[PDB]
Every structure is written in C-alpha cells, then in structure tokens.
Homo-oligomer: 159 residues x 2
C-alpha cells in the first residue's frame, strides 16, 4: 500500500534564505551543525539536480548505518524539494521506498513554514510503525534547528 | 586580451573516484580537509549544475576574503569540469574573469592525471603577473593533496 503522513514545522528564518541553507546546502552543513545526527554526506552520482544519488552516513549509535537518497526535483521557484529514500535504513522486507516532499512557505511575520510530506510504499496491506514516522519528523526538526542556529550565529551567511 | 596557462598534476587516486570527491563533492570536503585554504563554501544560486553560483570564503590571512565561482559545465562522461571566477579575489581593475577547465584522465598504473587550464580575460594589452598564476596552481595542488589524503585514510569513502 501507499501511506502518506504530513506535518508542518515553523522557522524564524525567511524562506529564501532557509531554502539555500537547509535544502540546497544541506550536504555541507548537516555534518557540521548536527554531528550527532549526520556523520557525512557523499555524492554517488549526478551533480545535484534530478537523478542525483547521495549516501548519508549516521554516527554510530543510531539505528541505521546509512541511507541512499535520490533527488527527484528541485524547484527553486516555489521552494519545493522532492527526494526519495531508496536504500538502507528502514528500506527492506516490507518497505520499498519513502518519497518525500518539502515545501517552504513565507509567513506574514517574515519567517517561514515547512510543509512536509512522507509517502511510504509498503508491501500489500502491511503498515509502517508509528515510531518510524515519529523518528522521521524528529530528525527533520533536529536538522532544521541546527541550521537555524547556525544562521542566527552567522548573519553574513547566505545573504 | 585573453591569456591561457595550462598545467598538469598527477594523482594516485583512480579517475572515477577522484572526480566524485574532488569535483562533485569539493563543496563539502574542502573546508574539512583543507581548513588553511578554504573556510567555507556557500551556494548562492542553482542546485549544482550549469549556472550555479557559489561563494568561497578564505580563512583570514589569505590575500582574498572571497571569490564567486560560476559552474559552466559538468561532464560526468568525460570527467570534465568548467567554471569561472567572476567576482572577488583578483577580479577587478584589469582582470574581468578567469575561465577554468579541469579534465581528469586515467593512467595505465591505475592512477590519474588532471589537465588544468586557466584562461584570463584582461583589459586591452594588460598582462597578469606570474605570482597570480603560480598561486592558482599551488592552491589547486594543495586542495588535491588534501582530498587525496582523506581518501587514502577512508577506503570506504566514494566507492
């Protein structure tokens, strides 16, 4: 089956600035600002656009050693980002892949909102556990806060 | 005028592996493996392909604060990389831009060779100083050695 789980998170960083840092430059920033979550990001193929395959490694202590993500679309105009988790991590036995979409929207107060959607493709009627969905949202939050903290500490970065 | 200066450097790393690390993932590796040369790399526009503009900052002590590079072409097939230096650094007064081409070629012994070409666009008959050309080649060498050292120390990276 196909199961979709959506969530929203708030950020104090304006959309344009956040998209550049959190989405476009996540590969270089994550391992620096969130060493407890991401140990390293390695390009496996492509130069950054659609079809690009990346390998994300996690510091030892996390449930997974690594995951391979594929960039599906990067829409600079609408601050939209689509990518899929296709190997490693929770991929296996009854879960074939996870398609994700991140959309960053500007808010009236000058900040932004991140609309997140995770779609799980499972075998037949098998469902995904709530913890797997929760863990996913928490890592997302954890990464955003790290990037957010870095930007507030370096006003000359990404602007 | 237009002045072209070419050079070649040898590497013990096979071409495919070196292209992924040194060219595709230079943005994430340089600030880590060569902190004395590059302090940080920031995406300014684009997702990595042609037209992408990046801002490279140098640790304080170097002659320049930063330079903006534009990706002109990324040829994954022929391991070719073209980019231009368009702002900051030596850009100014009589130098409009520097177009560079890097081509990585495999050698018989399993290593590789990097064919480097730097083309300077200057005003009228003004020439560039030899030091500027020398400094450019040395930084290139410095970066390559750092990446090379990192790969030999992490056999599971980029493969």
């Amino acid at each position: 089956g196909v199961f979709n789980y959506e969530t929203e998170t708030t950020s104090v960083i304006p959309a344009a600035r956040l998209f550049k840092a959190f989405i476009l430059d996540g590969d270089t920033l994550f391992p620096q600002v969130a060493p407890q979550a991401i140990s390293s990001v390695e390009n496996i193929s492509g130069n950054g656009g659609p079809g690009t395959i990346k390998k994300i490694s996690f510091p030892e202590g996390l449930p997974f050693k690594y995951v391979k993500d594929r960039v599906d679309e990067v829409d600079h105009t609408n601050f939209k980002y689509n990518y899929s988790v296709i190997e490693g991590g929770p991929i296996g036995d009854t879960l074939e892949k996870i398609s994700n979409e991140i959309k960053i929207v500007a808010t009236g107060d000058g900040g932004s909102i991140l609309k997140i959607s995770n779609k799980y493709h499972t075998k037949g009627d098998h469902e995904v556990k709530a913890e797997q969905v929760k863990a996913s949202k928490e890592m997302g939050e954890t990464l955003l806060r790290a990037v957010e903290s870095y930007l507030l500490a370096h006003s000359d970065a990404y602007n």
